[PDB]
Amino acid sequence: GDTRPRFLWQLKFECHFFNGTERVRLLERCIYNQEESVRFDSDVGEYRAVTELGRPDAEYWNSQKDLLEQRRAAVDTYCRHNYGVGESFTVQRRVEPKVTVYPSKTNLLVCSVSGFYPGSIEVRWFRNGQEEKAGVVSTGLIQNGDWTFQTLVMLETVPRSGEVYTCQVEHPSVTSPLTVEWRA
Amino acid sequence: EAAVTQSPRNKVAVTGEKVTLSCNQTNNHNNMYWYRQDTGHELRLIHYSYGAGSTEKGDIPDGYKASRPSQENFSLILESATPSQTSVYFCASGGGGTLYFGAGTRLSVLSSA
Amino acid sequence: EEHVIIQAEFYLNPDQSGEFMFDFDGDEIFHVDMAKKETVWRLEEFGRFASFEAQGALANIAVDKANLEIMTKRSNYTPITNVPPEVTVLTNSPVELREPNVLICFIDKFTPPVVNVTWLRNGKPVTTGVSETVFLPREDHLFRKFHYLPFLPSTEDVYDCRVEHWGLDEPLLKHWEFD
Amino acid sequence: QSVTQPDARVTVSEGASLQLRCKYSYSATPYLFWYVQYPRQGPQLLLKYYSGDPVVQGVNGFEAEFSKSNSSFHLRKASVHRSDSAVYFCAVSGFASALTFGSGTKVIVL
Amino acid sequence: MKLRVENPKKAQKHFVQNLNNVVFTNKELEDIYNLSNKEETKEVLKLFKLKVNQFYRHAFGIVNDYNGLLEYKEIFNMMFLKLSVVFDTQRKEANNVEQIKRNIAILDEIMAKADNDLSYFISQNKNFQELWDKAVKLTKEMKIKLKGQKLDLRDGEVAINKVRELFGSDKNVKELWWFRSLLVKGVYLIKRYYEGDIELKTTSDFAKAVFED
Amino acid sequence: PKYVKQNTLKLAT
């Protein structure tokens, strides 16, 4: 059986954007196994050893004038540049959420909103007028991996016939809050 | 003076000793090689270099390490000498098609009862 | 913070596996295939609007491999500690018999980036239409991976997402079935 | 073993004629060479074939024929002077311009 | 100076110029080929081996002619670092004909990318361009000043001596080892050509620049 | 519109 030890090396170049691209922070990091050894934080301006293993790299790389130069300008040439490149299908991506409520065994009700993007969403549980809050329990936002999200907002319930339970959600895909009524 | 200058000429090392062989070439050649020849056989290269700072493995690098600190010098290093390394080593120069070898060096690694 | 774009690369020994990919708020924009050496867009559409010179990934991964060597040695051959994955299985949307749905297998918080995933239907392996994702990055430097299984909801079918990883003590099977 | 020499040790009485057999394997754009090594010394360029006249005009009355046909680079001399008692190596140039020598034939002139 | 790629796209530095032992030995290469152990593979395997050979010649071809340009190691090492990655695939798909073909197309791309990066750094160093050309000039001058000159190869440093002899006073010949190395290479070319071997014309970018007009 | 990437750099020595 294969039980040979493993050695992994990861490299990450992170572009963090705040309010459009008004503020941009670039974090370049080197990771050996599961330990970050060295990095370049544009907020710092030079490489910094995160670990003793990484000291040689910080010294070597910071000795390269042309390199620090390119890195210190990467927030523009790399970060802002790539942001613009895909903004139209990423930042401006919007897919309307599919909402459908139904009961479950455990009473217990579940709203279920799926296939939406971005992930910023609000789910409100309504009982014909009011808004329950004590029995509400959420599974939290769930990233499906295919550029869509889904979350399940449940509701503790002691219904009587004629009641009108309704689930409402607001998401950047629609201007007016979606709503789905339940009868029981 | 010789075009290709090896050194030392003879070397007797105790098994485990660190042995360094030197080679100088005034032919202004870029390539340099190191071969070892066991009595009654052909030359088999250990390491070669295509310029200062460069060094690549040959057909039989195991046990040896080469260094090319300058355009004229290419030394062969034996970190921990072993009896099997007992042999005659030749250095060679090159820039024009053919290789210009040196006198050669006799190395004997003793010990090991 | 509002958005994060991450260029994530890794090289793993002795499997000699490497990966090059771009991440946007946790979702993959694309990655370039190791072997085919071509840019693969997560969503077909993306390629209609952007482009990437795959050859660039090759140069990078090549240096990444050289660095894994340098690093492994500098570390004195200190191997990586296995961290088992967390597996969860759930559908793309609420199920309804006779209604085409998708089964999603979430592999999360694990390392190294090597795992074997097989889908089981009533104990029998299913490959028809299955799909998968490449190793996605995490802030803690661990990985995430998705596996999908299109299917037809039924009351008789009982699925399993079988996951293997050196971090586990044995293959992990995550059950799932209508109701 | 790009190049090969079947003759380990070939002795020939002085004045006679000698022929060292050498067949290669690169069979593409062969850069064939012949080297002679006298005792206590290092191999010396004996003669070389680039790409032109299949009959190599060596030195000291030496000559070698490059027959892409029989894919060989045999070495032969008219009169075997006793001043030729040494080992002979045929070889090919490599990618890094390194020579790959054949087994080597030792000649003892009587 | 005539470039291998006329309008070079910018080149990247990965700072890999100090790496050594990046060139795979024949044993190493043979271990890779021996993985392609199937009749169906044999055909393409032959194609593969040819590419590797061409690849190696292409790499050293650059070092032999451009060792004067600083970035030359960087370009050379990047070639073998990339090749090391292609072999990872080869080792996993030793009998996958289509994938082996793809790996072949990738080696070309790697070579083409090296020619590109080469043409780029040369186009960033006018000085080098001039000195290289001056060497092709001084070597052409040698094509005549050697007509019936006696040149004994099998003896030490005949070449550098003939270079120190004909131009031993030139500022460049005196201060630049790489300039000298090109000149000496030229004396071996002048002779080998004059001895019935026009093959030299297309053996390198230097030989091609000297034996033309 | 082409995505741009940062070059991987060789570690010390």
Automatic annotation (TrEMBL), chain E:
Recorded coiled-coil stretches: none
UniProt xrefs under InterPro entries: M_arthritidis-der_mitogen (IPR015326), M_arthritidis-der_mitogen_C (IPR042074), MAM_sf (IPR036342)
Any matching Pfam family: MA-Mit
Protein name, entry field: Superantigen
Species whose genome carries this gene: Metamycoplasma arthritidis
